[PDB]
Ligand binder design. Structure first.
Ligand SMILES: Nc1ncnc2c1ncn2[C@@H]1O[C@H](COP(=O)(O)OP(=O)(O)NP(=O)(O)O)[C@@H](O)[C@H]1O
Ligand SMILES: Nc1ncnc2c1ncn2[C@@H]1O[C@H](COP(=O)(O)OP(=O)(O)NP(=O)(O)O)[C@@H](O)[C@H]1O
Ligand SMILES: O=C(CN1CCOCC1)[C@@H](O)[C@H](O)[C@H](O)CO
Ligand SMILES: O=C(CN1CCOCC1)[C@@H](O)[C@H](O)[C@H](O)CO
Lengths: 288, 290
């Protein structure tokens, strides 16, 4: 993949990714009680965004299965927005701890089935944000319904409002009809998700892997992996370890396109028309 | 300010900033290598290589002046499955602050370089296509700056807006505005000036040695165009503009031309990001028509 190509093209033995951001400003500070990490966002919806991240961090931390920063405080800023203070963790990009993270992510997804966890619907107890965009987490018994309505339709409604894109509307109407067939008659079980498991949101230290910047809800376990695959950066051993514990159910490859579609639509909304072509192309591929 | 607010909320005397860049953005990714750090941009669309070649050409034109620090382009790689990656030198960088007045001086020198040097580019435009963001621009050489700008910047953006949005108000306001443009340029000498082309605050930075600028979309234009995007989204210290205008003072009619150049950037933002930018685009046209 991209990293092997870079090593070859640049003729370098080492190639360690770095591991602030597109959404919020981020800075570490030393304080009298030790280091902290602070995210700042000046938009009006900052507090909602950070409160969703606090809720997500707390939900993951309650499982005891993965290491994530402790949320400390959400502070309103004069002049608009908010700051979010959390535990500082010394970190480097994910490399040797990839297979351990695959194990942990599979255990996290399986926790709702095997732990003392009783969540039998999809969604979440509070609003979480995809980036800047507030999400509806209203509980639903049917995962394809929840995902179609509260993830894909929400993004395409925003595309319609802001871009008024005819091809996106027309393709979505056809894709809506196909979505149930992609699920192969499977019984989907709710799985607690990190929700934004891009390679830039995972890392490691000497103890093991670390994950951060979650946007959590109870979803289909497979949705977690789509963004990890589409932007790369995870070693193969991450997926090997994960699928040893959660094998690919039938139709996985086609659902992967559906879940990657969501992320393309989200990037179209956050980052503009550069992401129109992969959004439409993915829909067309699903409709072929 | 925000750091006093953190000291109070956390009840700490010290609040000492520290630490590295991190993972980052749709912008790209940084890597440590055997030859030092690199930064890699990736775009999987079929036009990725054209886009990055425009950026390399822009970086090379700026580096040739020796007046401003930009990352050295290293390689453009065709990606399996379509698109390309662009590798350049990595620079450890912070937001522009202490080096703002130095950057103002360099940017003025950059704009004066073509007029004052030996080899003189005597038209507006560029020898290759460059993208301001993702949309390719036409850089066809033109003797007359208001012609170049109206045709290959404003009309190009408005044609896209007509194609994709069929916006009645934009269409009618452009029919009225187009004829008024020459009034903003009469009685002034406009010399082609090499521009960075996308100098908003998010494309400039600094390190211990001096300021750095990057992500250019270069062409030969009216020097004032450079400043429109810098002003309109803020983020530059006042001393940047003070130092700049000590060397190139604001010519008569500067504030009205500033609206025209800001209009271009608003139209470009509408084509990139949608209707959130319709209101400033149309309103800027109305201001110009009053
Ligand atoms: N708790 C932490 N302690 C130390 N460093 C951190 C911590 N959280 C994040 N970082 C670093 O700072 C970066 C900020 O990441 P993140 O919070 O995910 O971005 P963001 O502000 O939401 N904007 P975006 O990247 O577009 O999502 C990460 O790559 C890490 O390198
Ligand atoms: N040479 C460099 N070395 C290190 N970091 C860099 C370098 N160039 C850019 N960056 C970082 O990457 C960010 C974006 O760089 P930029 O050239 O503007 O990317 P971009 O792809 O054009 N952005 P986008 O329009 O969203 O795709 C900067 O804000 C820096 O943090
Ligand atoms: O920003 C994120 C990851 N993408 C950044 C742009 O380059 C590709 C990876 C995630 O935090 C998330 O998918 C979304 O962008 C939040 O808006
Ligand atoms: O992204 C750019 C600057 N704008 C980003 C949204 O906040 C206001 C500043 C530039 O690269 C360019 O002027 C154009 O937006 C296409 O990317």
């Amino acid at each position: 993949a991209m990293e092997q190509l870079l090593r070859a093209e640049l003729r370098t033995a080492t190639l360690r990714a770095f591991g602030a951001g597109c959404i919020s400003e981020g800075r570490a500070y030393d304080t009298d009680a030790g280091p902290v990490f602070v995210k700042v966002n000046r938009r009006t919806q900052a507090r909602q965004m950070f409160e969703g991240e606090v809720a997500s961090l707390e939900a993951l931390r309650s499982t005891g299965l993965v290491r994530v920063p402790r949320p400390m405080k959400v502070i309103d800023l004069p002049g608009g927005g908010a700051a979010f203070v959390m535990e500082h963790l010394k970190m480097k990009s994910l490399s040797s701890q990839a297979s351990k993270l695959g194990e942990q992510m599979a255990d996290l997804h399986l926790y709702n089935q095997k732990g003392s966890s009783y969540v039998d619907k999809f969604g979440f107890h509070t609003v979480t944000c995809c980036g800047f965009i507030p999400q509806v987490n209203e509980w639903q018994d049917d995962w394809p319904t929840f995902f179609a309505r509260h993830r894909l339709q929400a993004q395409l409604d925003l595309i319609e409002k802001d871009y008024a894109d005819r091809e996106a509307r027309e393709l979505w109407s056809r894709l809506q009809v196909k979505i149930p067939d992609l699920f192969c008659g499977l019984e989907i079980v709710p799985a607690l998700l990190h929700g934004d498991l891009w390679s830039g949101n995972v890392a490691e230290d000497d103890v093991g892997p670390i994950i951060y910047d979650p946007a959590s809800f109870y979803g289909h376990s497979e949705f977690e992996l789509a963004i990890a695959l589409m932007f790369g950066g995870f070693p193969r051993s991450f997926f090997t370890a994960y699928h040893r514990k959660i094998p690919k159910a039938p139709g996985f490859d086609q659902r992967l396109l559906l879940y990657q579609l969501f992320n393309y639509l989200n990037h179209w909304n956050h980052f503009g028309r550069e992401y129109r072509s992969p959004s439409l192309g993915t829909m067309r591929r699903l409709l072929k």
